[PDB]
Symmetry: D2
Subunit: 462 residues, 4 copies
Amino acid sequence: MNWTVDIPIDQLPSLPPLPTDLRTRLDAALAKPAAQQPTWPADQALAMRTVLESVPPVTVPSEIVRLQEQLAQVAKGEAFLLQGGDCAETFMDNTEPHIRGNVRALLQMAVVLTYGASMPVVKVARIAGQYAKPRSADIDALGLRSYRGDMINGFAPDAAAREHDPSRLVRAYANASAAMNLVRALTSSGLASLHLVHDWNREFVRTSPAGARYEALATEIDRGLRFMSACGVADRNLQTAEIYASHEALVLDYERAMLRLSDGDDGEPQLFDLSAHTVWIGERTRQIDGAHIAFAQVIANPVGVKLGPNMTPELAVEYVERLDPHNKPGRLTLVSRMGNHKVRDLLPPIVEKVQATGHQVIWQCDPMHGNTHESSTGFKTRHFDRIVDEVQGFFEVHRALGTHPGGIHVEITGENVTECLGGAQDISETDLAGRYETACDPRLNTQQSLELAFLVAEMLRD
Amino acid sequence: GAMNWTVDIPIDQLPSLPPLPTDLRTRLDAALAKPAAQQPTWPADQALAMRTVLESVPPVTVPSEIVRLQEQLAQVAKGEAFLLQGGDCAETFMDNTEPHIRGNVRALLQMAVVLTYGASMPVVKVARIAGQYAKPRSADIDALGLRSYRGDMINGFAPDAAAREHDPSRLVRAYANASAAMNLVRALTSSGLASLHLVHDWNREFVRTSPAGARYEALATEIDRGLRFMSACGVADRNLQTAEIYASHEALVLDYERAMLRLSDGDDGEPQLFDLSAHTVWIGERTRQIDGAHIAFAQVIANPVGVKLGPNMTPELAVEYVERLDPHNKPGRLTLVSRMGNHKVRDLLPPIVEKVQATGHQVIWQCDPMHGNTHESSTGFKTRHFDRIVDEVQGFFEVHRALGTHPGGIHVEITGENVTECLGGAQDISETDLAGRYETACDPRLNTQQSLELAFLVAEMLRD
Amino acid sequence: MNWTVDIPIDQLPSLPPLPTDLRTRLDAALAKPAAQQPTWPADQALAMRTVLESVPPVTVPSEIVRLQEQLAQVAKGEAFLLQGGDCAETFMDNTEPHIRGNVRALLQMAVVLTYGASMPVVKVARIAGQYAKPRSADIDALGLRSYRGDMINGFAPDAAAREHDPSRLVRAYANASAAMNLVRALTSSGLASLHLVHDWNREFVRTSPAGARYEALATEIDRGLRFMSACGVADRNLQTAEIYASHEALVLDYERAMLRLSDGDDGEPQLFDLSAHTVWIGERTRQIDGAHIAFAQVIANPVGVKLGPNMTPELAVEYVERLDPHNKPGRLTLVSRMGNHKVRDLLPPIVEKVQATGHQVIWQCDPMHGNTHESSTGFKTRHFDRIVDEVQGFFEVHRALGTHPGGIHVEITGENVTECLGGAQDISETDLAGRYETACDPRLNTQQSLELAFLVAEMLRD
Amino acid sequence: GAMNWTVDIPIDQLPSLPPLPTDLRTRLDAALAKPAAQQPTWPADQALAMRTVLESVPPVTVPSEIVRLQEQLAQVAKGEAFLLQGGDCAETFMDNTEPHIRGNVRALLQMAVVLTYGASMPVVKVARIAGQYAKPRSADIDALGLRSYRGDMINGFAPDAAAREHDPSRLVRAYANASAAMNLVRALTSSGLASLHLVHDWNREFVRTSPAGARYEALATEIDRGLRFMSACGVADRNLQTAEIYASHEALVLDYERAMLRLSDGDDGEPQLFDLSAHTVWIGERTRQIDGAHIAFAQVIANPVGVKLGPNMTPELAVEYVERLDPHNKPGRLTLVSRMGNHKVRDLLPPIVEKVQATGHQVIWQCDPMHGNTHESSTGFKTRHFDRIVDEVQGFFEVHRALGTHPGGIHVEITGENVTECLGGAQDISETDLAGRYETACDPRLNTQQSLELAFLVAEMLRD
Ligand SMILES: [Cl-]
Ligand SMILES: [Cl-]
Ligand SMILES: [Mn+2]
Ligand SMILES: [Mn+2]
Ligand SMILES: [Mn+2]
Ligand SMILES: [Mn+2]
């Protein structure tokens, strides 16, 4: 009568517990305060975690130690990181076409950034779990509790949908798993083929209005590829695409339910978060003595920390001390998100002081989150131009210092959406109402995210 | 509602999907309007609701992997590869766990290296996994008086009436579980678990801790010297291509298979409907009515399919299944799965094979030695003797040598766990032992140890 | 007393004869008149051939059927031919440094031409046997019998050195074999490495005076390579360099002494000239009813015919009928050498008529031989500018017709010689006396031959 | 002058070549000023003329291939590869022909696949070829009264005085021939002759047409199932790396080796003198004087070297050869080649091996079972019994198992032709049979068939 189906969550027997020592450590760490947590009752949360402790993981430990070695390259200045995908994944759009479109977009950026940087690009999707977000107000504009992502409540704007229901924990796992399944299939398919991927770049250059501007680079990359193949490289000679899953580690009941211990064949058991390959802690949940930082300390996965305009060099050094106590290159990524009017002035002393610690972090640019604003026509938006200028400024600080602009972190879709302003298409304030589809922040659309790749490429070539 | 131990999914904001090519629609409706044996008895409206939820989820498999399976099966069909099919009789939601999945995968990779060495040719590996959650039943009421367990897609194993109701909510749980497991098998097959060298040191633990170990040793040593020869000639792990394990299950519940249909793109011809719940599916002895929906549905999908053939099979009906399901003469499109009993395969198969070979089509001939050799023990549990299974395969091989056709593969029920379900083996599991670790939700599976011991036994039939 | 050593030619037992049928055919073919043959007596020539009939070949049949398949690509428009090396090899300079320098030069041209054509480049060295040449006069300027190449007489300008001595037949074999030995070793060594090879191109661009002009292409190719390697290609993934030996088939006593029959494992025995992989017949020895054309007819090797300004479409069709009777793509190369003032007008009707035969020949440009002239300062020379303009004109005819400019055929050295005029260095008439080292025609030197590659690349990119 | 059956080469316009690094010059002159056994007795001025002709010709080998050989020999030295060395006792100009070269190469590739399979590790292949044209002699006058045949670099086989004069013109003929053959072996090893699969069907013709065939069959079948397993796992010809056969000869004639010295570039450290007449060279029992030129010359070149050690060897002198020739402790720089007799290897080798192992250097231990087991037949020809050769290798293996050191390889005299030079084998070649096809210019070689039969015999010693 209400267009809903109820799926019973199966109550299945448990596997053995994690060992008691690591449990003792994890418990000590999660007694710390945790910001932004759902407000569901403990018994229900407890119940839902118990279901997730025995489900097949989303990732496995070997992929994560592989990601760790690729990231060390990045930290040593010999590889570049690309991380990008939906601001918020929703369950409704966790469909083959949308997932295929974001995977394409990302591989499309990747070949352009690879040519331009002249080194490997490690590809990290914001996918298979980006279902939770913070909020600054518990009351939104409609006078409702805030949407906090599909792992927590519903986007629909009513009270019943907005209550925090922990059965969304198991709904998230399911969608994460199904999405992961599909990204592994698509990355071992013809979709990954370099030759394919950059014929899209060429359809892009034909159809775009700033197309004349990018033709030269597009033709060069093309000739690059034609030269690979003329020298006898065919696609089975490359070893296949690797696209890694990441999300913000926000909801501790989910992340800790997804903890596992590794074979001990690799060598030495340890705790991995198998909800994803790498995760990051956000600007609202990175309190130095908080449950999120503590949790990142305990997990073997590479981690990242979002660093905003209020950040001090001294808080940054503490992150490095807390999150890279063994000095492992690429274990910690520090993510700059300052605004394009501020990165040139604010980032430099942060880098100087962290570089002096003797540790090797990855410096990655997030040119989105610092540069958001509301248009006169209602919608929340970002100016493409300001986004570009932030990557520009981040490259300029790294050049001036001799450190390595390690990568970017961007919110993008393969959809032809009208969320961010400007770009070649100069989406205006008027155009935002046509296809404003984000469940949260404004995403660069397919064309804009590509255009940005071209522009970051020319930056890597200087 | 975690309060009601349910996940709540709304259907109303699932937005209309592209219509099918007109003919494909006409043929699909035509196939599904035909009588269908062994379907669940749940309401049409609840089913529909659940089908609609599954129409928009991520597929378990993609078309490119299915076209690739066809090319590999083509080779088996031409006598230049061999087919290994194996896994649980019935996967349950309860044991869809990393340990169980990983054991199953291991047992398959382990068998496959042995079979590769014995065959001197490639082995294609197709797991019964990520959807084998439905079974037929010859009687709707079981020995306890209860509506029969039909597998976890349909009802629950628990021996009570209420668990036995047919529940369409199981269509979405079966998918969730199927997705989750496929995601893990893909993770496993491109890890160190797939490296042939590790994979065969498990077989050597097996030879040393095994009552029949002295029997299988020479061949295990030979395989090992194979692997080291390979490596000594410069072949390293990353010079190989990583392992491919395909998913298969019986295509039984037409509500599930139809909701999992998808239409392929332009980049490989005219568009076609693929069943994206699996790589390849087969049709069982009870649902293989020549004019029924299962056969009709098999003819609309592009996947490789199989059909089970038991002891009342005729050479004439076999030919009819080949001309219906492989109408384009595409080798490896169709496997014929023989399951006769060991006391009958020697006499009943050859004429089915002569007549099929005469058509000019190239089917894969595969042996299912499980399902014709089942008996009930004196203690209470239904079981199969290991010697009868072996013998059926032996006879399946004598049939083909004598005709000069290709014994193309085996289809077995196995598990990575040392259950005590099948009598005999090196372990000589007795009737008394069967009470110990009988864990199957349906048929008796071969042991970790018995399923390996059988790879060794068939690897030597391949060598003669 | 005269600074000479006499090496006895060993009189060794024979192996079995070639089969009688093929012998009967070969004899019928060599009864035809043969121009430009040495004038040594028959008994001595006979004696020296008998020595060569049993010596290890210079090439083996499988390499030649491999060359045949690579050349078919070229003829079908999907690969480009580069052929280049000394105008005349001499024994004196058949040294590791000179051989290494010509092999480098050629691989250096090859990567530039590969990038520029966007398809494979088949590399054919004028080497391991280019020891014989024609002459138009039997009397040279010093009043001596003409130098005719080291397989025939000595370059030194005296009577005793200029007599035709057939012991030079066995001296040629030796030098050919030793040179071949070294090109196989160098092509399986680090010398072949794409990355190495084009760092020479970059030293070239730094040090050359037209360097600014070629920087862009040089940087692009560089980025191409850096992109290959960033995508995970390392040198063991390419399968190694293949440099084939060719020379003009001029001296029939040598070429027929080097005939062999193939295993018959490949399938079907047949006659191969195992003095080289491919050979060509020159403009002075290509009489339609002559011994050279007949000899090319009988051998399985790919062959080429030099076509000059006197050539008619109808003589060209006859070559195709004579030399490609089975319609095998790339069995016959037709080599255009017309002069840069004439190729645009003279080549086109030749191509039209041969293309209409339905056969698939390779059209290759020889921009050297048509464009030679003597300077006021004594030396015989060619103008770089005229050489370039000839390739230009050959590309223009092929474009206009829709046929495939299949390749070039050039006389080059790795030495820093001063033989050809102009180029970036603008070697003048005055500069020719500094390093005029050719035993015959003026070679493009290392810099000029590279510059020409760059220029032919830009032609292939239009 | 084809009139005088000579090729005439002028020396006067051979233009001065870069001087050597001062120390390298000093050390080279120092080594060559030391007494030198077994050198030809030709004039200094004619020699000089010929050395000058060879100073400017194309090398037989290039330095990169020699550094690559060292890395491969390092592995043998560490117990993870095996060394196969084989070819003619004496190459002659007369049989430096395609058929003869091709037979030799085949016989080596054939042995090498068998040995690879038996060792379960890589086999490095070093032919005696492209320069093995000189031999020592214990007496300058032979049984006919003639100045002894010293190999084709020095004089002629023909039994007449004038052919027996030492002729320095042979230094250039030896190079021409060496070049020509190396060119062909490089052509052959990157053709279909090198593909492992063809290469082992020759071994199967061998098993079927052979009196001992029933003996070697199981192992030939095993090898074949190895090769097909390899191919079934996706390994194709072009996924392998093509065959590498290295050239070696005894470094005997110091006029030849010194004219073939060359100096390496910058791109691998400080420049060094390489002997570019070969990949690796060894020093024989007669020229291995500790303070002599051969040893002194070995210490100046960068190539891997070997030294032969016969029955009057001490553990102390062996240590001295290791500290002189492998002064940098570089594994695989030095091979010690044991050639004791089968009746002595069991007792005389172990103490040489203990003392060498104690130094901390890593030599390759290689067995030459040919040169200690030679006798004169009752019919006229000097010969070796096949059983004695086998036994020496057997004992060489018992020495190393018992110490836990690595039996690193064999160094054998073989040919692709069925000569009748060595008594016994499966063929049981008798004394009477030896007259049939005795063709060697020096020592008795193993047959095509005997050299294969020995790979099988050693492959099984490697398996125990
Ligand atoms: Cl319906
Ligand atoms: Cl001297
Ligand atoms: Mn966002
Ligand atoms: Mn079953
Ligand atoms: Mn010329
Ligand atoms: Mn000897």
